[PDB]
């Protein structure tokens, strides 16, 4: 097995607060 | 880029890379692989390069 542990809550919060959508829907995309 | 009109260089120091093997006798366009790869890139992190 391998080891992995969660980060601090504050770090997770700020990171999640900045996640723009990768794919959007606009009528002008070539 | 998909049209023969633009070329792009991406500055990555190091990265995790994955790869696929294809039969030489099967015509294909590999655009969807890159497209879905782009579909998972966010300021938090990126998936492995295909």
């Amino acid at each position: 097995d391998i080891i992995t542990r969660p980060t601090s809550d504050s770090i997770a919060a700020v990171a999640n607060a900045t996640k723009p959508a990768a794919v959007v829907s606009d009528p002008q995309s070539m | 880029v998909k049209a023969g009109r633009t070329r792009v260089l991406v500055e990555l120091g190091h990265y995790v890379y994955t790869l696929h093997y294809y039969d030489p006798q099967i015509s294909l366009d590999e655009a969807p692989i890159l497209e879905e790869w782009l579909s998972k890139i966010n300021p938090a992190g990126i998936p492995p390069v295909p």
Partner: protein, 49 residues
């Protein structure tokens, strides 16, 4: 009139690579409860980083 055939030592495939799999040839005790085994490059080894 008897026949023998050893199994080959080296891998025999279209493409052969080298991967990191600790203790893959271990034989003694169970050893430390710690392991590192990456998949071949055809898969995603993100979970290890």
């Amino acid at each position: 009139m008897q026949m023998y055939q050893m199994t080959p030592p080296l891998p025999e495939g279209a493409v052969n690579r080298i991967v990191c799999m600790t203790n893959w040839a271990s034989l003694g005790d169970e050893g430390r409860g710690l392991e590192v085994r990456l998949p071949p490059p055809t898969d995603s080894s993100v979970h290890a980083y």
